[PDB]
Amino acid sequence: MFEVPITLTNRKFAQRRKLKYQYINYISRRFDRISKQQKKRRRERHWRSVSFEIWRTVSSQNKQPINKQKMTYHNFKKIEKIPLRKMEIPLLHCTKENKLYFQSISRGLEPLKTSTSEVRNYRTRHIVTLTDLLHLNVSRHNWSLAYKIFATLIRIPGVQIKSLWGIGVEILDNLSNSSSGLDFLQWMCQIYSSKSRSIVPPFQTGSRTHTAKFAITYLWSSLINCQKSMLIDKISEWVLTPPFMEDAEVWFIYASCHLLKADINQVIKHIHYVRTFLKICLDKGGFAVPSRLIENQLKSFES
């Protein structure tokens, strides 16, 4: 009952995607007329936009006023009447279940059964159960079992690593042995920061433009591994290392390394240092304490 970490068993789902986006094309085409193939699916899905540190959204202003009803019964069935027969042609080529699916989604009914729920694969079905038990155990705080699941899973030759947050929070709550969550994360960044589609939303990403979740979370969580303190010049040595200039969050990580190292004229230079990086962190999309609070800690230091 959880997402599976495998490419979905194929044929019928793809030919259904065909029927769907093809009919979609015919209806929206005739709709723009009245307002006047993997590749067909491709163009179709294509022409469309593809007090705490909230990476805020884009709110409501500068957006256009209105519309008033476009679609009566007669007018809609006008748009619908013809593209449904065009569909009658290749429906004759697809399978009866697929045809039924086309009939029902085109009535507007939504199918009872998931792609997983109708999938049936023998190595893949076993991997489905494996991954499932991983997610279930991780939900169940069963970090021991869950760890066994994870190791046995990553063993298998089919799994590339979405599963990393599983192991980040996994080894995190594990505390047991193995070179830990931080080690894993900095490994992720060291292996996958160099040249050395379906599956991919944002929580796993490529390093052309922002790889987000895992990077920022090892960043902050490492600054909290300095909350353990009051290793740092290491963390900001390899936060110093990378150029991926649209961060600023590593500027606040940097200035936090200088506030943690500031806890004699050396300590002075560290306090002037954090004073600098807080403004070169006003460079970008701001992470702000009132920051006169930051400075007030810095005057408790100036003591």
């Binding site: 009952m1 076993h126 159960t129 494996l130 499932d132 038990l133 279930l136 155990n137 069963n142 079992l145 066994k148 699941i149 190791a151 046995t152 063993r155 298998i156």
Partner: peptide
């Protein structure tokens, strides 16, 4: 498989 016990899952990963 949803309603599965830890030893079953364990011997499972073993057989995996």
């Amino acid at each position: 498989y949803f309603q599965w016990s830890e030893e079953e899952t364990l011997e499972f990963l073993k057989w995996m």
